[PDB]
């Protein structure tokens, strides 16, 4: 029998638990605290999400088996752990209330260690550290036999989560040559947004600009692939940018124009990735209609925009933090993270 976990209740549970963790003083309240610290501070991202998700599920509905990863697992209390983790923890909680400190993963239950019916030592794992963390996370979840124990361990896990750092790139290096390669690289999917965001930082860093990127497929988005970048000055957005690596559609335009017009933002740029070039819209019509709503709309290919901003741009004691924060805020994929890591060592 599967258990249908109430995600509204789960959200309130984890918010309470985070609040308890933020004021927690005694974290050694049970013998699993050592294992909890080692998993949460450890290097295996998927086991961190599996641990938080299973503890949250049991603290919300004690009928779940917290070792179940899928609702079709052959155990009583199987439940849709992917849905709980992606909808509640990733979708609503980690960004706003944990500063991306669990890892800022967008879809952690698509990683190989989560693609099993059960979280068990029968699942393959690399010798050494990973094998240790697999068994530790199993042991903690096996100990979460009651709702109150699950909640107690959830608060401990979030207490240590708050101690993690959310930096993925890390000496006065040759930031000139690396930044230019990222600017001018043939982008794909979300790497288009990262390059565009970096370009804007270069151009505006010295002009007081603050660039903020947002993860794709938010609630109420016009399409699933569009990615929002806001450019602030004096803490007011003056430019709203949308990045898409699929052709923009009329709903994308309508949503962005209406959203800017409401906010009093008068400039919107739509940036087209290499796979967004074949138009489904009449860009001229969109611009004309946008003007009637008092919004100045324009379109550019991403790589043209990035190289133009770079040409127009002027120290680099802030580029690393900016990239780290941007990768965190968009819940960047591993491919994107590996690309940025690789080009900083090359």
Q: How far apart are alpha carbons 346 and 335 in whole angstroms?
A: 16
Pick the binder of its own copies from 166, 221, 289, 307 (CB under 8 A).
307
Q: How far apart are alpha carbons 322 and 273 in whole angstroms?
A: 22
Q: How far apart are alpha carbons 194 and 121 in whole angstroms?
A: 38
Pick the binder of its own copies from 267, 333, 337, 343 (CB under 8 A).
267
Site map for its own copies, 25-64, x if CB under 8 A?
----------------------------------------
225 assigned ligand-binding residue: no
Give the N- to C-terminal CA distance of the chain in Å, as an integer: 52
Per CB under 8 A, 256 contacts its own copies: no
Ramachandran area for residue 189 (φ above 0: left; ψ -120 to 50: alpha; else beta):
left
With beta carbons less than 8 A apart as the criterion, state whether 228 and 203 touch: no
190 assigned ligand-binding residue: no
156: tokens are: 């401990």
Q: Which residues of 83-97 are buried (b: 16+ CB within 10 A; e: fewer)?
A: bbbbebbbbbbbbee
Q: How far apart are alpha carbons 261 and 9 in whole angstroms?
A: 36
Site map for its own copies, 142-181, x if CB under 8 A?
--------------------------------------x-
155 assigned ligand-binding residue: no
Q: How far apart are alpha carbons 237 and 210 in whole angstroms?
A: 9
Pick the binder of its own copies from 296, 333, 337, 341 (CB under 8 A).
296
Per CB under 8 A, 309 contacts its own copies: yes
Q: Which stretch binds its own copies (CB under 8 A): 135-143, 162-170, 302-310, 328-336?
A: 302-310
To the nearest 10°, report the CA torsion of 340, 341, 345, 346.
-40
243 assigned ligand-binding residue: yes
Per CB under 8 A, 310 contacts its own copies: yes
Q: Which is nearer to its own copies, 71 or 178 (CB)?
A: 178
Q: Which is nearer to its own copies, 73 or 297 (CB)?
A: 297
With beta carbons less than 8 A apart as the criterion, state whether 50 and 142 touch: no
Q: Which stretch binds its own copies (CB under 8 A): 25-33, 98-106, 303-311, 323-331?
A: 303-311
172 assigned ligand-binding residue: yes
Residues belonging to the binding site are 122, 172, 228, 242-243
Residues that bind its own copies (CB under 8 A): 180, 184, 203, 207, 239, 267-269, 287, 296, 298-301, 304-305, 307-312
């Amino acid at each position: 029998m599967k258990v249908l976990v109430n995600h509204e209740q789960a959200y309130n549970v984890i918010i309470n638990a985070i609040n308890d963790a933020k004021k927690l003083t005694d974290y050694k309240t049970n013998n699993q605290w050592v294992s909890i610290q080692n998993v949460i501070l450890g290097t295996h991202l998927t086991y961190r999400y599996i641990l938080i998700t299973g503890l949250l599920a049991k603290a919300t509905d004690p009928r779940v088996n917290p070792l179940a990863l899928q609702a079709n697992a052959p155990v009583d209390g199987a439940y849709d752990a992917r849905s709980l983790c992606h909808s509640v923890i990733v979708g609503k909680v980690e960004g706003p209330f944990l500063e991306g400190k669990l890892g800022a993963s967008n879809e952690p239950f698509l990683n190989k260690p989560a693609r099993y019916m059960l979280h068990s030592s029968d699942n393959p794992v690399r010798r050494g550290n990973d094998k240790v963390l697999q068994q530790l996370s199993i042991d903690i979840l096996h100990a979460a036999t009651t709702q109150t124990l699950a909640y107690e361990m959830l608060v401990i896990a979030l207490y240590f989560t708050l101690q993690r750092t959310n930096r993925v790139i890390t000496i006065n290096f040759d930031f000139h040559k690396i930044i230019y390669n990222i600017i001018s690289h043939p982008c794909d999917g979300e790497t288009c947004a990262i390059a565009a965001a970096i370009s804007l930082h270069l151009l505006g860093e010295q002009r007081g600009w603050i660039i903020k990127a947002h993860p794709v497929n938010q609630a109420g988005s016009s399409s699933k692939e569009i990615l929002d970048i806001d450019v602030y000055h004096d803490d007011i957005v003056f430019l709203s940018i949308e990045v898409k690596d699929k052709p923009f559609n009329y709903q994308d335009v309508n949503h962005a124009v209406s959203k800017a017009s409401a906010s009093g933002i008068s400039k919107v740029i739509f940036l087209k990735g290499p796979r967004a070039t074949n138009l489904d819209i009449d860009e001229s019509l969109a611009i004309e209609n946008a003007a009637t709503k008092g919004v100045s709309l324009s379109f550019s290919d991403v790589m043209t925009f990035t190289t133009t901003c770079y040409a127009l741009s002027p120290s680099n004691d802030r580029i690393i933090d900016f990239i780290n924060n941007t990768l965190k805020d968009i819940r960047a994929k591993d491919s994107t993270i590996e690309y940025i890591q690789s080009i900083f060592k090359n």
